Amino acid sequence: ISFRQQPEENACQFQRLNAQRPDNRIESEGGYIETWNPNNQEFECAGVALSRLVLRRNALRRPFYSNAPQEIFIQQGRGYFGLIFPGCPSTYEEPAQQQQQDSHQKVHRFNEGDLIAVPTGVAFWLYNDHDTDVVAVSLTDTNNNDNQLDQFPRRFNLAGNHEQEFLRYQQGNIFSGFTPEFLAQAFQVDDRQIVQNLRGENESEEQGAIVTVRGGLRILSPGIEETICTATVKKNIGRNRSPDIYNPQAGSLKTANELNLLILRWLGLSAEYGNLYRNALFVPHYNTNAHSIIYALRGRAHVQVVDSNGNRVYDEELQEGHVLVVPQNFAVAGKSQSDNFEYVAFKTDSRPSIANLAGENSVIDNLPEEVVANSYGLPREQARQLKNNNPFKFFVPP
Amino acid sequence: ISFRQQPEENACQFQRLNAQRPDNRIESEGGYIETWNPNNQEFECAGVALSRLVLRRNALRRPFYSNAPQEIFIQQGRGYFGLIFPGCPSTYEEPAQQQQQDSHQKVHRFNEGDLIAVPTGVAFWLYNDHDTDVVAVSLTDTNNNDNQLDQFPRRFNLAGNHEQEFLRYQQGNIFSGFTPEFLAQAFQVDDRQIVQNLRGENESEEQGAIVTVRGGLRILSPGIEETICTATVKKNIGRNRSPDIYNPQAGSLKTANELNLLILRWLGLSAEYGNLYRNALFVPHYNTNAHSIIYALRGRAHVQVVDSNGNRVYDEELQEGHVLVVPQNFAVAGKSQSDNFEYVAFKTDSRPSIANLAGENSVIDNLPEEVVANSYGLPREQARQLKNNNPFKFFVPP
Amino acid sequence: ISFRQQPEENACQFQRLNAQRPDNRIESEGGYIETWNPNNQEFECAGVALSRLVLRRNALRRPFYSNAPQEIFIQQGRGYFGLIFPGCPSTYEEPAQQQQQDSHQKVHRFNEGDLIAVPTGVAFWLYNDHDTDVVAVSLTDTNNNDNQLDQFPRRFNLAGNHEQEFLRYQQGNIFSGFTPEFLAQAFQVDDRQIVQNLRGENESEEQGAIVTVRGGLRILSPGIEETICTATVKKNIGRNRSPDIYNPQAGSLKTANELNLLILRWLGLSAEYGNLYRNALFVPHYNTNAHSIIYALRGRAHVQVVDSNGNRVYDEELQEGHVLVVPQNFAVAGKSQSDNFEYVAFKTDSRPSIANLAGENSVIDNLPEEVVANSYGLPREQARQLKNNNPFKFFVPP
Amino acid sequence: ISFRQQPEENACQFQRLNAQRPDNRIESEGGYIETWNPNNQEFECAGVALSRLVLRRNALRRPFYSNAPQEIFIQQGRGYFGLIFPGCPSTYEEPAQQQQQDSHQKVHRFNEGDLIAVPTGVAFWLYNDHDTDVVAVSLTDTNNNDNQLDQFPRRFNLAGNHEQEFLRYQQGNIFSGFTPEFLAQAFQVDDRQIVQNLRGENESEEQGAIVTVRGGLRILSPGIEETICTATVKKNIGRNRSPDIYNPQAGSLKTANELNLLILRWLGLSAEYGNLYRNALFVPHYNTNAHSIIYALRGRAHVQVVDSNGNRVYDEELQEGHVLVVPQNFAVAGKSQSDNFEYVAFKTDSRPSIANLAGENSVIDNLPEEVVANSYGLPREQARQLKNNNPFKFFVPP
Amino acid sequence: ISFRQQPEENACQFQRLNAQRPDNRIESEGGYIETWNPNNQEFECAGVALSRLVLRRNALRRPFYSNAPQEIFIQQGRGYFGLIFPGCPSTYEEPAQQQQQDSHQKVHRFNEGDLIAVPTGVAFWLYNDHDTDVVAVSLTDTNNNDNQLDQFPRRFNLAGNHEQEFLRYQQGNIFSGFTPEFLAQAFQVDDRQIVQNLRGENESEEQGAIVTVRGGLRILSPGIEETICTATVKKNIGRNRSPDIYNPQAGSLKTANELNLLILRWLGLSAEYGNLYRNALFVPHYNTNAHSIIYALRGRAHVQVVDSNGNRVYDEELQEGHVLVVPQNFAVAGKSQSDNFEYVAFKTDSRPSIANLAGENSVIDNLPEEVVANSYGLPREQARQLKNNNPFKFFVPP
Ligand code: NA
Ligand code: NA
Ligand code: NA
Ligand code: NA
Ligand code: NA
């Protein structure tokens, strides 16, 4: 399911669909954030915004929450993240060096291939504790029903004194806007310099969203607390040894949707990770109920996309680090021109449905032979060939 | 329930409501499609598009899917249709002249009075195998949540090389946009002329959406396959020997909603079929939770519609083949000027609720006598008359 | 949950947030209705309209229904109201002075502190039978999914011949628009002067929505009828001896949401009533999933609101009878400058979720100590103070 | 809805139905508990157990939880109760005489007429702070799906050293069963006499479930905390100024079901409170989907109950403090022989449905006249009398 | 949630609770199956049966389905399993050495710590491809609503000619019961020796449920197909780097319930994996809504269990490979007497709720101080100690 705002008149009427690369980079201390322009037609149509975060060893992306739900895919690396679900008690705690030292909400490990769901207004932070840079691609669903503000994807930063991620595309931290007397009362701290730091007064716009932790972070990691407050918030789909669709001579597909990661039901979002081997084809298909935002992860594939007029709105080699939006119901097909073309496709429904146009149990396969024969002007025998020559589903070997 | 986009500022503020007739006809080989202009205020307000299809004996409306959910009402005729639900296995099959000849998804018979639900992105085809022309009136819900593209009702045609139904009102087939090398791989057909026909290369813009089948079509007709893949997709309401509301001296009403046809729950749509006998009245009423799109089927009725200012925005004889949109909450009443005025009313909710203003259990009937007396400046006795003189619900005899 | 239309581009981007007072008063016989301009940025952002009704002893607000769901809070007074749920049989009846005198739908008592839910298209009337004026503050959710007309909050009046509440802000009664011959047939009344009064012909635009009942109203008050037709439609939250959050030295909070008043689930709305004692603080917090429309009921409080840029968009004393909209996710904090500051806060979700930024189980409390230390540049000890110095939730004593 | 275990073979086959009075009293310090024998046929059939608690001024019924869901009706008196929902944070707190003194879960006020829902395993305590004795009648649903133990209604007492309520009918406190070394570690109390008292070692079997608090109790009373952790758990139905069905010359009915008190949906239980005035009749009716456990509150009524053989299994004056079980689908009718007969009827469904056999919209009223005429051997005119002579619903005046 | 049959009268009334070890072993070719007697009081009470499977390198547990839902926990080892969901198309396929070689349903990898959900009537097979023996502990929910046969847990074996697992405890394969002429027609195999083998005719009762695959198995592994047919059926909880509750000085807990593994919602089952370090305590607690079936995985713990009479029904060292049933609502506490006591606890609800009796946010912590003081006969100060001395949740360090 999904419940989203429709795009403005004509947004999904295309002369041509363009693949997109980021157009801005925001520098910080231990990494950076790159943004795709959400004002481009492809993104206006899909009603979403996209960004990419790089976190070096010991870098902390300091906590923030957003008005629009997010899905974050971990392209590379491993580390820790927390989500703060409001009012949920702490369940991670340690004895002083019995009295209590520190306690906090569950800290999660993440790995390459993980897809993480961040509900609207839930605070998120991410940390890399390893050499390999973490690279995360974040889809922010601006048109989602859950966003009751206008279609600007905001980051409400809990810390720092820097530029909002997507501010440059529109026509300080959250604490920094409150007066010192409110914050001293709120936190019962008399130390006016505790409140100064809280407000970000002891830093420039160039410390950024991401800080490096000298010596590394130490955090705890090996009724309502073990039920709703500890619901699952991520699922591995990129590294998984169990794809949903698999042909060892053509490729694989694996989805994280609301049947795999229940919280996606509330978000109205899902994602798929696919592999397509050299010269293999993902058959013409369309998504009945979702836009697809395809981020090329590795390699390259010749991709074609067809609109409701049968126009070829996109025809080229989709390369690593570029993004192609395939609007709901537009048909798409791809032939990998790499040993293994790899991609993540975010989708704007929690249970997206693929309709294959060719192959076993495809639309053509499921029409009566005489209907295929009469629709295409074909003798009964050539119609039977169209229905039966390809015995495979989804992927076709070289 | 329904989840739809609201109309633009002022769309439902009317100086006058106009009844509408089609304004375009698209010719094909065995029939035609007529469209109502969806840009007219009445349709902008309702957020929907309407069309009418005529299929002569042996005519096939070749498969297509759409971005917006549809409800199709069979005004006359009988025939076969298929819906292709993606990935559902074939369940209709026959032995070669044991090995398998052809197999395909369930083929359904349709009859006059049938209301058929077509979910977003589900492919549909229709065939008439009888002398009587089939006439189908199709409501396309452009503002529906399920449509994540802009508010243009598209037809993604699987076959042919013709004009999109509603294209003329905006500011080739799906295969025709793919290169021949993609389609040969996708269908494993080496015959480049199989792929030519598939793409519609062997036909003009004037073969159209509808083809005639010489000698007639032959199709099969007497776990997940007998459960979800064979869910009901139509319900008879026009020919039914069991209306929901009935008075043999005034008229009848029968609804297909989500309690009768479960799939309507996902579509957010329903329809009603009514009869009103000469000089009988359907009392002033309004729909709490839906627009009503009234297509006159037979005869004529004097209809009045009142807006939130108590203005009479419509006051005339609604005739057969004209359409009147009654916006949500506007009050409407009708007096049949024909032996039997017959109408289908599509509604933009899966469970629309009628609030009668006069008659048994109406709004007036359910207010305390002293409230009716004090609201209208009436003596207790004249208030009692207003509540009680009409003992009938919905319809009132001549 | 809620399903609402998003506001236009930039609506929730504020240079400053203004508190608002009503800007129009509509006079009637036994009371008046005051409206806030819904075109002001604060209301455009929230997608809602607000009004205030005053009903003197024996005054009847004559029946009406609206396209948008309402929540009405009873600030003062007591009286009777009815809601007319269409087609539900009468369940209140009396013997003639056995035959039946009058019968009607359930009449409800209301009291100060009551929050009443009025679904879209359900007719409502209100009566005051006591000396104390009734004062009701009404939130109309114009952007709600249930409103399938444009974003004008309409009142479809069943009686009278006066001005629609919100008409002055856009770019007769319902019966008055029908011809006398339709109404005589509909109600089977031959008396053409019964129909004249019904249409409001025997009154000026200056009798208004509210009439005085001379001698007072007499009404009855001590399967589907005792189940769905008598579902609960109100909950006391202002006068309640059982707040949800309570600290006798700082304040209280009490909510009516879909867990307390089930019908709110369909409306997508809820409300909260809070008390804050002199010099006590409601800590910086935000609502994850709702706009807050704060109506000051008694006293005054210094309030600050911070946007996604950390800008202080509102900083002043919120006074009784003024309204402050806090957009979804914006942070807000308040310090009462009165013996008891009292407020109702309507919220645009049926289950709104508050995320406290300071105090026990707040966002800061639930982050690892080393994350708070590294986010704010603080030694481990000053981080521990930020997490632990305030042991209270929500409210902090003077 | 409800999900319950069916009774053993023949349990609901009755020679006669007997009204029942309690058969045991358990004495304590400030009040007592009386139990009805759950082994009697009437209770075996209904699959439930019943008890009655009396709490004098300053008496505390010390905390306990049970394996079966309960509904408690407050027949008289007023006081405080708490329910402990596991893991929910405290939301009632006070400053030490800023640091925190005590904090605890919400304390609720209760009043006469309140119906309180206690889910399976949720701990409950009750306190009377007024002169008038509190009298509470408790229905324990032993056959409920939520009880996964055998059909013995247990009380797991958190305190005391006394007899389990229903133990005498089968074929120490919870802490008392743990060894002192477990409890010292669990509560980190070194004081072995703290643990002695906890275990109930400093008291006899004759301090009982109920203790008197000398000087009276002092308690606090004027994200997940204000949402799920503060869901409503009671609804007034006995004292309510708004019955669901009302005739000032015959009686009233008011229900607390899952549309009024949402938590009842999980419990599978509901209750009704009725008044019937001298010589008035509640018409023959049956409950489609629930047993009815009728506790007479005040006065007396001649009651008759008819089984599936048309046998009169009960025919007598039901008196105050007696209980009559009416099995699902058995027909029942009553004529009050008191100025006002008052009763609470617990029902074993969360949304019980009454089917009236006589009167407006009854079963007879809703059958075609010719069906009533042919079913009873009656001329058309006598059939019309049977359908129409009684114009009232539910109750009929003297 | 769960919907289960209640146990017979007195089943959960215990003189003493006994830990249980298996009492039977069924030998096969590459491993064995051990069963616990389901007729023992502990299992009668819980309404469940338990077994343990060992599969050596290259051993295949041949396909079977059961009348009762199962949860299988992988104690050690790694391998492949399939579940056959009826009518779901194949999604794993390979090209002949383009035509199709073999195709089949998704084959899943499993690892140590995995919890696998097997719905009623879904066929399951398991294979070990590694040196380490796989050991799986299987809970079969005999009293589950989904089992509409009597309370005998059956295995309907698709292959083999051996003893049913639990047959010895009651008062050939599925094909073997059909006549050869039915099977030849059903599979269109003329070879009467193909059908002989299918029926298990070419093997003794001593080939067993488990076969060894010489040279090892080769299987494929790297619309409705990628949605419902590929829903998740397992979740790792034993090996997971992210417990729900964690204290590095006492222990951890991690649950797989319906918020983590959605299919458990239909099964009415869940499981927890816990670690408890030497001399640490899991505080007295109870489960509100589930039986707990505790299988000791490693080490030993002193465990005590208390019934509704405060009787200590179990008091001893629970050792590895023994099982202890803790009935719903009975209180339990454990102190590890090993470096790391490890256990899996199956629970008879899809969302079981733990109610802690001591510690932060426990039942005692959430009662008003004066209620704890008056319930236990304690001065205000000793009551405060009981509420506050243990600042930890669930686990308490040595
Ligand atoms: Na298009
Ligand atoms: Na209007
Ligand atoms: Na902002
Ligand atoms: Na009987
Ligand atoms: Na017991």
For chain D, give the number of residues. 398
**Residue in this structure with the two tokens 């579902």, named with its chain if needed:** C231
Of B271, B276, B329, the closest CA to residue B302 belongs to: B276
Is the CB of A393 less than 8 angstroms away from the CB of E225? Answer: yes
Query: Is the distance from CB of B128 to CB of B56 less than 8 angstroms?
Result: yes
- Do C212 and C300 lie in one domain? The reply is no
CA distance C178 to E130: 83
- Which phi and psi (to 5°) does residue B246 adopt? -150, 130
- Do D214 and D358 lie in one domain? The reply is no
Q: Is the dihedral of CA E96, E98, E100, E104 positive or negative?
A: positive
At residue C256, what is the residue type?
A
At CB < 8 A and 24+ separation, what contacts does E252-258 make? E252/A222, E253/A226, E253/E394, E255/A226, E255/A227, E255/A230, E255/E352, E256/E115, E257/A227, E257/E350, E257/E351, E257/E352, E258/A262, E258/E1, E258/E350, E258/E351
Query: Is the distance from CB of E53 to CB of E31 less than 8 angstroms?
Result: yes
Write the DSSP symbol of residue B169: G
Structure tokens at C281: 């603080």
Residues of A in contact with D89 (CB under 8 A): 87, 89
- Do E265 and E377 lie in one domain? The reply is yes
Q: Which residues sit directly before a break in chain A (C to N > 2.5 Å)?
A: 97, 171, 222
Residues sharing a CB contact under 8 Å with residue B193, sequence separation 6 or more, in sequence order: none
In the listed set A204, A237, A270, which residue is the last one of a domain according to the structure? A237
User: Entry resolution in angstroms?
Assistant: 1.7
- Do C270 and C207 lie in one domain? The reply is no
Gyration radius from chain A CA atoms? 24
Contact E95/B at CB under 8 A: no
Antiparallel, parallel or unpaired: β C245-247 and C251-256:
antiparallel
Burial class (CB in 10 A: 0-12, 13-18, 19+), D298: middle
- Do C179 and C242 lie in one domain? The reply is no
DSSP-derived 3-state class of residue A384: helix
Structure tokens at B289: 């939770």
Burial class (CB in 10 A: 0-12, 13-18, 19+), B190: exposed
What angle (nearest 5°) sits at the alpha carbon of residue E215, between those of residues E214 and E221? 115
In terms of CA atoms, which chain C residue is nearest residue A90? C366
In terms of CA atoms, which chain B residue is nearest residue C127? B371
CA distance A186 to C282: 8
Q: Which residues sit directly before a break in chain D (C to N > 2.5 Å)?
A: 97, 171, 222
Residue D34: count of CB within 10 angstroms of its CB: 18
Of B282, B307, B280, the closest CA to residue B359 belongs to: B282
CA distance B233 to B381: 52
Query: Is the distance from CB of C349 to CB of C270 less than 8 angstroms?
Result: yes
Shortest Cα–Cα distance, A32 to chain C (Å): 16
Residues of C in contact with A120 (CB under 8 A): 288-289, 329
Residue C221: count of CB within 10 angstroms of its CB: 17
CA of C313 to the centre of ligand 3 (A): 9
Q: Is the dihedral of CA E367, E371, E374, E378 positive or negative?
A: positive
Buried b / exposed e over A343-372, threshold 16 CB at 10 Å, is bbbbbbbbbbbbbbbbbbbbbbbbbbbbbb
**Residue in this structure with the two tokens 């590379």, named with its chain if needed:** A76
**Residue in this structure with the two tokens 């006469």, named with its chain if needed:** D112
In the listed set B211, B237, B263, which residue is the last one of a domain according to the structure? B237
Residues of B in contact with A6 (CB under 8 A): 5, 143, 147-151
CA distance C252 to E52: 55
Best mutation target among E84, E100, E224 (most B Cβ atoms within 10 Å) is E224
DSSP-derived 3-state class of residue B32: strand
CA distance B372 to D130: 45
DSSP-derived 3-state class of residue A103: strand
Query: Is the distance from CB of A138 to CB of A225 less than 8 angstroms?
Result: no
**Residue in this structure with the two tokens 């009937």, named with its chain if needed:** B365
Query: Is the distance from CB of A342 to CB of A272 less than 8 angstroms?
Result: no
Query: What separation in angstroms does the CA of A248 have from each of A394, A398, E89, E97?
Result: 13, 12, 18, 11
Shortest Cα–Cα distance, A71 to chain B (Å): 19
At residue A355, what is the residue type?
A
Q: Which residues sit directly before a break in chain B (C to N > 2.5 Å)?
A: 97, 171, 222
User: B267 is in which domain, residue-wise?
Assistant: 238-398
Contact B376/A at CB under 8 A: no
CA distance A276 to A299: 10
Structure tokens at E252: 């951890």
**Residue in this structure with the two tokens 């950390």, named with its chain if needed:** C310
CA distance C216 to E198: 88
Residue C333, beta-bridge partner list: C304
Query: Is the distance from CB of C64 to CB of C118 less than 8 angstroms?
Result: no
| Widest Cα–Cα separation across chain C | 88
Residues of A numbered 252-271 whose beta carbons fall under 8 angstroms of chain C's beta carbons: which are they? none
Which CATH number fits the domain that encloses residue E247? Answer: 2.60.120.10
CA distance B266 to B118: 10
Residues of B in contact with E87 (CB under 8 A): 89, 223-226, 229
At residue C201, what is the residue type?
E
- Do B188 and B275 lie in one domain? The reply is no
- Do A232 and A277 lie in one domain? The reply is no
Q: Which of C108, C246, C253 sits opposite D242 (nearest CB)?
A: C108
CA distance B83 to B89: 13
Is the CB of E223 less than 8 angstroms away from the CB of B88? Answer: yes
Query: Is the distance from CB of E31 to CB of E61 less than 8 angstroms?
Result: yes
- Which phi and psi (to 5°) does residue A92 adopt? -110, 125
Structure tokens at C139: 């939130």
Count Cα atoms within 13 angstroms, Cβ side, for B22: 17
In the listed set E237, E267, E298, which residue is the last one of a domain according to the structure? E237
Buried b / exposed e over B307-332, threshold 16 CB at 10 Å, is bbbbbbbbbbbbeebbbbbbbbbbbb
Of B330, B287, B45, B12, the closest CA to residue C170 belongs to: B12
Of C295, C290, C255, the closest CA to residue C272 belongs to: C255
Residue spans of beta strands (DSSP E) within E43-182? 49-55, 59-65, 70-76, 79-84, 92-95, 100-104, 108-110, 114-118, 123-128, 134-140, 156-157
Query: Is the distance from CB of B360 to CB of C96 less than 8 angstroms?
Result: no
What angle (nearest 5°) sits at the alpha carbon of residue E327, between those of residues D176 and E18? 80
- Do A64 and A45 lie in one domain? The reply is yes
DSSP string, C113-150: TEEEEE-TT-EEEEEE-SSSPEEEEEEE-TTBTT--S-
Q: How many CB pairs under 8 A join A and C?
A: 229
- Which phi and psi (to 5°) does residue A381 adopt? -75, -40
Residues sharing a CB contact under 8 Å with residue C309, sequence separation 6 or more, in sequence order: A164, A167, A172
- Do B116 and B255 lie in one domain? The reply is no
Q: How many CB pairs under 8 A join D and E?
A: 229
- Do B172 and B272 lie in one domain? The reply is no
- Which phi and psi (to 5°) does residue D257 adopt? -130, -165
Residues of B in contact with C219 (CB under 8 A): 368, 370-371
Residue C340, beta-bridge partner list: C277
Residues sharing a CB contact under 8 Å with residue D366, sequence separation 6 or more, in sequence order: none
Of A90, D165, D211, the closest CA to residue C368 belongs to: A90
For chain A, give the number of residues. 398
CA distance A349 to A346: 9
**Angle, helix D369-376 to helix D380-388, in steps of 10 degrees:** 110
Burial class (CB in 10 A: 0-12, 13-18, 19+), B74: buried
CA distance D362 to D358: 5
Gyration radius from chain C CA atoms? 24
CA distance D93 to D219: 10
Q: Is the dihedral of CA C174, C180, C185, C190 positive or negative?
A: positive
**First-residue to last-residue Cα distance in chain B:** 35
In terms of CA atoms, which chain A residue is nearest residue C385? A189
CA distance B296 to B52: 13
Residue E321: count of CB within 10 angstroms of its CB: 16
Of A156, A284, A280, A160, the closest CA to residue A211 belongs to: A160
Of B41, C145, B11, B5, the closest CA to residue A8 belongs to: B5
CA distance B284 to B356: 6
Gyration radius from chain B CA atoms? 24
- Do D230 and D304 lie in one domain? The reply is no
Residues sharing a CB contact under 8 Å with residue E298, sequence separation 6 or more, in sequence order: E320, E338, E340, E341, E342
Query: Is the distance from CB of E196 to CB of E202 less than 8 angstroms?
Result: yes
Q: Which of C3, C173, C188 sits opposite B3 (nearest CB)?
A: C3
What angle (nearest 5°) sits at the alpha carbon of residue A211, between those of residues A207 and A215? 135
Structure tokens at B124: 């549909």
Residues of E in contact with A99 (CB under 8 A): 391
**Angle, helix A380-388 to helix A369-376, in steps of 10 degrees:** 110
- Do B34 and B127 lie in one domain? The reply is yes
Residues sharing a CB contact under 8 Å with residue C48, sequence separation 6 or more, in sequence order: C38, C139, C140, C141, C142, C143, C291, C293, C346, C348
**Angle, helix E380-388 to helix E369-376, in steps of 10 degrees:** 110
Q: Name the experimental technique.
A: X-ray
D194: enclosing H helix or E strand:
helix D192-198
CA distance C358 to E393: 22
Domains contained in chain E, number: 2
